[model samples]
Target: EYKPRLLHISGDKNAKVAEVPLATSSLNSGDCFLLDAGLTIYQFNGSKSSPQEKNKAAEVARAIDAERKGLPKVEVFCETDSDIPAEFWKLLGG
Candidate 1:
């Protein structure tokens, strides 16, 4: 497995959503990275269920599915609210 890259996940007040970094070199258009404001040590997308959590998970999962083909050098973007499963992070610095 690759080293767990560092991702700066901002949230709530003035939170930022960006790709963070290129996993490596040699990338072009159609290539992309994944970012999800993963559940903190507290929240669990497990047996626990909530409308908010489920909807967030679904939105994130849709984006996560975007890179199902593979992964490569990055292009970052900014929005407001975003998220995902597991211990995922956004590569903002490098």
Candidate 2:
């Protein structure tokens, strides 16, 4: 199987979402992300990400799950409030 894709979700004026490079560098402190890791979808909220962005990203994540016929599991992480999974770091760093 190919590497999982990373989707960047951000916007202050308008919610902008798109596929981005699958790396830690692609994450910003002011945005949200959806890491499409094959069987699990991770919604990552940056330390400074706004609530609007977080909620919007969650909606997008659910949309993706629906597109995949609800086969994938969905998880969420807030950088300022939760411990991120090591698997996520491994995938993004490598």
Candidate 3:
């Protein structure tokens, strides 16, 4: 069975990528995140996040896709944008 996972990419210099709560409250505006929805990986960029952090999250997402048996759709989202997929919020327990 496949399960959804939410990972937060935050910090400076050597940033850390760790699993976070599967809730909307877990999202912060100063970091990047990767939402692994089994067949889709959503890359979220916080409004105030640094480019370095976004790259870090993308790297992690690529690594995940590399190890998966099949390719997964990767989507990039911006916090400043208002068109975030509704499925994203639903998955996050909104």
Error of 3 at 21 (Å): 3.3
Looking at candidate 1, the ten consecutive residues that score lowest on lDDT are: 39-48
Each candidate's clash count: 3, 0, 0
How do all models score by TM-score? 0.28, 0.75, 0.73
Residues 1-94 of candidate 3 have per-residue lDDT tens digits of 4587878877766767677757566576567777788788777766556566777777777677679854778776646565245677777655
Candidate 3: pairs in clash: none
lDDT of 2 by residue, 29-90 (tens): 45777787878777776656667677778778777877998787877665654434667777
Compare candidates 1 and 3 on lDDT and give the better one: 3
Minimum summed lDDT over a 10-residue window in model 3 is located at: 76-85
lDDT of each: 0.31, 0.71, 0.70
Best by lDDT: 2
Question: Runs in model 1 with CA error above 4 Å?
Answer: 4-44, 70-94
